Symmetry: D2
Amino acid sequence: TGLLDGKRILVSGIITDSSIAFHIARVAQEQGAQLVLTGFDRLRLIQRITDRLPAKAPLLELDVQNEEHLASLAGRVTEAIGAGNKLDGVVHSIGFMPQTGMGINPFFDAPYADVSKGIHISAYSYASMAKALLPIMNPGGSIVGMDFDPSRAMPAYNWMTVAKSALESVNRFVAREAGKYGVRSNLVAAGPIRTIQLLEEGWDQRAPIGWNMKDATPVAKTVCALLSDWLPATTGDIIYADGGAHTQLL
Amino acid sequence: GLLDGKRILVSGIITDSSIAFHIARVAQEQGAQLVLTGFDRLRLIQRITDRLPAKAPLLELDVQNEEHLASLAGRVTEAIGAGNKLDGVVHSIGFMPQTGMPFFDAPYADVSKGIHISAYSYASMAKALLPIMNPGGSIVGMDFDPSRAMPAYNWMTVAKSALESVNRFVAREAGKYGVRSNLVAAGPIRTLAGEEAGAQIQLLEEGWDQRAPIGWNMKDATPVAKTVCALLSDWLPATTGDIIYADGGAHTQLL
Amino acid sequence: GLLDGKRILVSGIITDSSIAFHIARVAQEQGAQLVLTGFLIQRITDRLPAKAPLLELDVQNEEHLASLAGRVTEAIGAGNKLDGVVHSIGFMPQTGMGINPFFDAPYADVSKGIHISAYSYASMAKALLPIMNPGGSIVGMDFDPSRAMPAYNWMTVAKSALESVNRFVAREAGKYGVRSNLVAAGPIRTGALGEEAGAQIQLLEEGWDQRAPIGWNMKDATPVAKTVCALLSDWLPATTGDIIYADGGAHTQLL
Amino acid sequence: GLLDGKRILVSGIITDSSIAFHIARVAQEQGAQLVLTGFDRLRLIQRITDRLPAKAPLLELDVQNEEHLASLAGRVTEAIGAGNKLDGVVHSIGFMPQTGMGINPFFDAPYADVSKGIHISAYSYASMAKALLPIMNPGGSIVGMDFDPSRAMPAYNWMTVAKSALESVNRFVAREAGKYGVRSNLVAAGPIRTLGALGEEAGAQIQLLEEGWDQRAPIGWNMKDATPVAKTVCALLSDWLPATTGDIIYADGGAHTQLL
Ligand SMILES: NC(=O)c1ccc[n+]([C@@H]2O[C@H](COP(=O)([O-])OP(=O)(O)OC[C@H]3O[C@@H](n4cnc5c(N)ncnc54)[C@H](O)[C@@H]3O)[C@@H](O)[C@H]2O)c1
Ligand SMILES: NC(=O)c1ccc[n+]([C@@H]2O[C@H](COP(=O)([O-])OP(=O)(O)OC[C@H]3O[C@@H](n4cnc5c(N)ncnc54)[C@H](O)[C@@H]3O)[C@@H](O)[C@H]2O)c1
Ligand SMILES: NC(=O)c1ccc[n+]([C@@H]2O[C@H](COP(=O)([O-])OP(=O)(O)OC[C@H]3O[C@@H](n4cnc5c(N)ncnc54)[C@H](O)[C@@H]3O)[C@@H](O)[C@H]2O)c1
Ligand SMILES: NC(=O)c1ccc[n+]([C@@H]2O[C@H](COP(=O)([O-])OP(=O)(O)OC[C@H]3O[C@@H](n4cnc5c(N)ncnc54)[C@H](O)[C@@H]3O)[C@@H](O)[C@H]2O)c1
Ligand SMILES: CNC(=O)CN(Cc1ccc(F)cc1)C(=O)C[C@H]1CC[C@@H](NC(=O)c2nnn(Cc3ccccc3)c2C)CC1
Ligand SMILES: CNC(=O)CN(Cc1ccc(F)cc1)C(=O)C[C@H]1CC[C@@H](NC(=O)c2nnn(Cc3ccccc3)c2C)CC1
Ligand SMILES: CNC(=O)CN(Cc1ccc(F)cc1)C(=O)C[C@H]1CC[C@@H](NC(=O)c2nnn(Cc3ccccc3)c2C)CC1
Ligand SMILES: CNC(=O)CN(Cc1ccc(F)cc1)C(=O)C[C@H]1CC[C@@H](NC(=O)c2nnn(Cc3ccccc3)c2C)CC1
């Protein structure tokens, strides 16, 4: 009697048990989903983190910058879920921006090689993952990616804010492609999660229902709502799981 | 069910084509216990609500009537039982006289009545019902994206722009009770409501299904009803003062 | 001069701190010939650098609106038309803006506020478009209402309605080859509400200058008057139904 | 003139149909003293800049070339004279290979092509501001060209993504430019006929996208004419929008404000 009973869902982005993807995976399993997980570089380490989830799930390697990993992804997922079975959901919870482009480094001092790598991993890969997986997705399916509202500039986030602005645009185009398969594509724009202090503290102040940066469960639940059959007419869009902070000036 | 055990008030049923009728039907299929509110044609509304899968008390509510608003919480408490509170409230009410739906020829008395019913009443209903809502509760109102002007919708577009602003303020008040307030912006639905405006609205409708990456079926209110039920559930707990678009993704595409 | 030879109507002067006073002053410095409307004001308008006829205009008065074009034609001379119109009018009773809880504003007060602050932008365009030249410009004053905030309450709702009205006025004005736009200004200084509200409104103001990349001086209306004159000029000829922000860039920054 | 005595750098001229050519022409008609920058085909660009109403020095600038960016301020100072600074900077540069914009499926654009397009179309707005802010006067203005990317559309594909990135870059450039008392803004223009080549199907789709624009625009939209766009850029370069920064001004006939 779970929200995602019987659904086959791929979840990328687990690195620690504080990863937003770890909480998404935990809630999806509690709700009856059968998962396939993807990890980057430190696969033995990631496998040990995935052992903390309530149910066993196969772990596949996926470096989104690696064309060979993307070319073989659908075949490897099909081995994991069984021939004749397809995915009902895909979760993109991947991001990266070198220290030259996010933090205390001046915005103007980020070399383009660093910005390009960050945009490749954080934005272009949302299209790459949809390209690889839409041929193995069922109608009524759902692709969800993680976002941080980039509509206004802010301290420190710098080039990662630019990568999120690009990701929002990529999501609208992925929705055009996914619609051909009867699949939805949406982003969840979350408030800050402890996975800068003054900026982050502003969310709880503005949020009419408050914001707890130490609690990823409300974000995971929102992703699961989009993976469910309960938002069937929403695509190319952004759902804000931020306590309502973006709707208030002060 | 998605809403098992939840006590939810649903306003705005007039016909079985009303978006509120479909919201009520889906909510009951999902285990919710409803309280319904109707305006003016109560005997007629009772014949329509007899078509729902489960019985529900029907209370009169004219949002322009201060006495109805002053007594609403007490009448709802009588219907659900002393000691019980609401978990959800659905505002599915709108009105704009014909004059407001040429743009310049709408008299202010007509525009004011339309804004009272379509936008101010969202605050009126929250004021009356928040004192009888449980923490984790949810208030949901119906919207039609008014970010851009369009043919014929005219002053009702202005009322929706005011409603979006009212929703952001209601969220500030509702938060004090641990309650969320959000709007669902739906695509056009064939509910009961000249040649020029007729042709323009036909073009607006056709364009909607063309732009929507997953298409849009104006004869099917179920996807909209499901979206309202998602907001009434425990599955969007960090969303408030916001707008969820149940429009096939049409607003995200230019062509 | 930026506005050399242009005939421009300017509403909204009540004191020499009114944003409309600064708009009128800058427009005259830039060579415009003005017609002023107000609703005692002659002593204030005598402080402008040049003489200008002052006509009475209560935007809630249907007779004033019906006779406005004829009265303006008498003032500027038969055979002459207006090139610009400035709406710098706003009103909200203390029940709807200030310290009063959002839920305690009666609709009669909110409706009067929306009539004067939003509907009148359409009323003024209806009255004046028949006497405007092609290439003309209508400009109204706005305060960004995209997010809720303390104290502004129902005046925020009136601005949300005004932004929607501006998009529809642009549709009508386009038929005459006239543009319609709003200038969304930062706060301008045009303990009276208590210690608590005073501190909250002070924080709202300090944050504005903090967020604005070029800063924001609440005591200086000249950057706002210059922005309105840019829209009245021939230099933004392809902008209509839109909003230009003269707020130091504060709305583009989170912190 | 609106820009009398102002020293303004204008990048992006390649043909006399370039939006930058019209921005330069209007700026000179309004009394500005220009410095022009061009990419790769400098001899060809000089023949085009001879068509402007006044002479202006032409400097080479490939925005992907770190050496050109490192020497730019010094070369501009030589052109305008020691002790003089710029009052304006216009970025009117964009590029996206055919794999990322046109008829090619959105999913078939390789990242090397997308990355080159984002480097030239978005990151270079920050590169140019970094190089030129040290030689800009207080009250100065940086303006870049945009095409509203808030909604997806046919064919524009990854160039839409590059514009979404550019809008975000503009908000961060405004934070840096403010330290110098300089504004940074974008002008989002409607479609302009700059330089059946893409086939019947795509041709009809792009034609519908264009016609819809003049239909939506309450004052209409003339796709042949960059002058209303050039005038809008000059308004931002002037002293008449002194409190606008990190922002976007739409010179699109009001099309983006109307659904139909
Ligand atoms: N932490 C927050 O405050 C916050 C708020 C809103 C949105 N988000 C977003 O949520 C997502 C997850 O971030 P997180 O906070 O959980 O941090 P995280 O560090 O736990 O997760 C980021 C993941 O990206 C993966 N990744 C990096 N390079 C990759 C590559 N080449 N191929 C594949 N995967 C790669 C990492 O291995 C890691 O699992 C990101 O998109 C982030 O931007 C985070
Ligand atoms: N039909 C669509 O295309 C569409 C699209 C998006 C949003 N909506 C919105 O959905 C909501 C419901 O509209 P609908 O299309 O189902 O039409 P409807 O006619 O079935 O419902 C409108 C309801 O408003 C009620 N109402 C009017 N005046 C009232 C008053 N004084 N007090 C109380 N109730 C009053 C009517 O009695 C009726 O039940 C409205 O907010 C509407 O704007 C409709
Ligand atoms: N911080 C601010 O002061 C600020 C910021 C942004 C925008 N604005 C807007 O600028 C405009 C002018 O406001 P202001 O700050 O100069 O204040 P103000 O009090 O000087 O101007 C308001 C004007 O509205 C007029 N008005 C009221 N009722 C009227 C009626 N029935 N008929 C005709 N005119 C009527 C008043 O006579 C007055 O001239 C308003 O739209 C306001 O919302 C103000
Ligand atoms: N044409 C339209 O419909 C339209 C609409 C809105 C915005 N815009 C924007 O206006 C700007 C100018 O485009 P246009 O339509 O005038 O086309 P264009 O081809 O005439 O201008 C593009 C310019 O970018 C230059 N450029 C490319 N690579 C470069 C590099 N490595 N270094 C330096 N410069 C480089 C080219 O040499 C050329 O001068 C672009 O930002 C474009 O996106 C165009
Ligand atoms: C070897 N070098 C890395 O491997 C670069 N590194 C490590 C690192 C980056 C920045 C930093 F300073 C410290 C450490 C990354 O690539 C980490 C990723 C993790 C996933 C993504 N993470 C977020 O998007 C995210 N992290 N924190 N926040 C909150 C926030 C809000 C506002 C301002 C600042 C922060 C967000 C929204 C993108 C960055
Ligand atoms: C007697 N006179 C009234 O009693 C006015 N009447 C009845 C009536 C209206 C129009 C009409 F011809 C005939 C009758 C109303 O006040 C009904 C309400 C019902 C609830 C609300 N309904 C919508 O908001 C709604 N109705 N249709 N659409 C689609 C659409 C989209 C864009 C443009 C046009 C249409 C919408 C979005 C607001 C109007
Ligand atoms: C003659 N009796 C009326 O006519 C009532 N009165 C006069 C009055 C009201 C309050 C007060 F104590 C003293 C005087 C009005 O109705 C004033 C109008 C003037 C024009 C409009 N004014 C603004 O829109 C405006 N005023 N202040 N701010 C800054 C701000 C920002 C955020 C929060 C709070 C403040 C704004 C944006 C709308 C209100
Ligand atoms: C003649 N030049 C280009 O072909 C040259 N190449 C390479 C190329 C060659 C052949 C080809 F076959 C496609 C692309 C460019 O990379 C030029 C740049 C110029 C600056 C930028 N240009 C625009 O941004 C721009 N160009 N057209 N439009 C209107 C529009 C709107 C919506 C959909 C489609 C079109 C826009 C908004 C981006 C492209």
